[PDB]
Amino acid sequence: PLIVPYNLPLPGGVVPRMLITILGTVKPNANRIALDFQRGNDVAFHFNPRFNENNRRVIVCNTKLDNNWGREERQSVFPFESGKPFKIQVLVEPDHFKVAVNDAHLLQYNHRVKKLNEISKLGISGDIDLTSASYTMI
Numbered sequence: 001p002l003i004v005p006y007n008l009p010l011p012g013g014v015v016p017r018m019l020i021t022i023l024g025t026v027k028p029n030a031n032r033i034a035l036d037f038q039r040g041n042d043v044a045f046h047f048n049p050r051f052n053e054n055n056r057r058v059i060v061c062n063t064k065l066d067n068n069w070g071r072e073e074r075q076s077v078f079p080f081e082s083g084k085p086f087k088i089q090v091l092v093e094p095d096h097f098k099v100a101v102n103d104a105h106l107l108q109y110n111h112r113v114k115k116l117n118e119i120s121k122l123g124i125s126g127d128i129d130l131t132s133a134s135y136t137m138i
């Protein structure tokens with residue numbers, strides 16, 4: 001049972017065929033989860049479940065460059081549920097991050113940050129009991 005906020009080092013950044021796995025359970029009455037795939041201060045890929053945005057449940061994806069958020073990409077499909085165990089798999093592909101939750105495809109996020117091998121940390125935060133975070137080359 002890891003401590004959130006949690007930092008996972010990604011040694012040598014990311015690369016296509018890299019599969020990052022995050023296992024956890026959403027706390028009861030949750031408000032947010034965040035994954036932050038960081039190139040130093042920058043956030044190459046921010047993935048942000050919000051359980052109550054104007055009484056809607058939304059996933060917000062974005063990039064942060066020199067302290068500025070870009071154009072959000074919003075996803076209607078919301079596979080998370082308060083109180084339940086989840087698995088998030090982030091596969092790096094040549095042209096995007098591909099995200100599946102609970103073995104079901106969720107979304108893709110085109111790479112805006114190009115220096116993938118400098119995206120050397122994944123921050124995991126929000127209303128979760130974090131069980132495990134690891135990566136594998138597939």
Ligand SMILES: OC[C@H]1O[C@@H](S[C@@H]2O[C@H](CO)[C@H](O)[C@H](O)[C@H]2O)[C@H](O)[C@@H](O)[C@H]1O
Pocket residue numbers: 046048060061062069070072
């Ligand atoms: O873009 C991701 C970040 O979103 C903001 S919340 C964000 O704020 C702007 C105003 O600055 C607009 O209201 C947007 O509608 C709203 O989504 C969060 O504070 C960050 O943590 C990122 O999640």
Ligand SMILES: [Cl-]
Pocket residue numbers: 112113114115
């Ligand atoms: Cl870049």
